[PDB]
């Protein structure tokens, strides 16, 4: 085993699992999913005695069951339900990398609305709805709404979070520290427009979001991390085990 030494010992045998995923979405103004996928990886950080043979089980076999379009593993994994078998390297390492496209849970729905008022103003209203347990909080949310290049100024009203028109980025950036599942918030903005060449219209870029939620958008769930060390005198039940899920947006755009 060239990725793990032979006399490792710890009085506190413990492991931490990280299911990190980036969820990507391209949605129409309608609300139809034009494209969507999750890319994720499971990082394991373990302080286990000896040369443990572990078993990683998740809700594969495709209650809760998800489909994996594809995935690669760390060399320590023994290819051939059919779960993962390995003698992990010590410390932190990437156990596997995977991709999903089906039954993804979109944590946010963005519903935009624009009204043209003459040739002088644009009235914009954007509502965001969190789609996930109420007991879970999202954080680091950011909703970026593009403004036309002939913008002379912007007025915004938002009860939750803080929004700032950024003229150099040609966008109103709305930030929200935390937001629980099954909620709804909105921002209204009035975009003040300068005169422009009447022929060339505005090709509205998509509104885009950023956020971080504590669960895997793919649906993945860790069921168990079994540790067997036949030589040393600690077993599976002696091991303290934790898991955390950090799902973050990648490209999460909504055409408006």
């Amino acid at each position: 085993i060239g990725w793990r030494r032979e006399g490792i010992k710890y009085r506190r045998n413990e492991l931490f699992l990280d299911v990190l995923e980036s969820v990507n979405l391209l949605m129409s103004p309608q609300g139809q999913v034009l494209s969507a996928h999750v890319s994720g990886r499971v990082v394991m950080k373990s302080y286990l005695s000896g040369m443990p043979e572990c078993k990683f089980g998740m809700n594969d076999k495709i209650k809760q069951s998800i489909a994996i379009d594809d995935c690669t593993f760390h060399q320590c994994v023994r290819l051939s339900e059919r779960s993962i078998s390995f003698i992990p390297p010590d410390g932190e390492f990437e156990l596997m990398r995977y991709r999903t496209t089906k039954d993804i849970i979109l944590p946010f729905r963005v519903i935009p609305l624009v009204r043209e008022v003459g040739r002088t103003k644009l009235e914009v209203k954007v509502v965001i709805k969190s789609n996930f347990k109420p007991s879970l909080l999202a954080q680091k949310i950011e909703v970026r709404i593009p403004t036309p290049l002939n913008t002379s100024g912007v007025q915004v009203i938002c009860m939750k979070g803080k929004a700032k028109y950024k003229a150099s980025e040609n966008a109103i950036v709305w930030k929200i520290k935390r937001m629980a599942g099954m909620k709804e918030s909105q921002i209204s903005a009035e975009i003040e427009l300068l005169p422009t060449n009447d022929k060339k219209k505005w090709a509205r870029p998509p509104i885009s979001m950023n956020f971080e939620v504590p669960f895997a958008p793919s649906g993945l769930k860790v069921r168990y991390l079994k540790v067997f060390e036949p030589k040393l005198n600690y077993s599976d039940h002696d091991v303290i085990k934790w898991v955390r899920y950090i799902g973050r947006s990648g490209i999460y755009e909504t055409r408006c």
């Binding site: 931490f16 699992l17 504590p214 860790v222 168990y224 991390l225 303290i240 085990k241 934790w242 898991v243 955390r244």
Partner: peptide, 6 residues
């Protein structure tokens, strides 16, 4: 946050 895995 981390949660216990039984």
């Amino acid at each position: 946050f981390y949660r216990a895995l039984m």
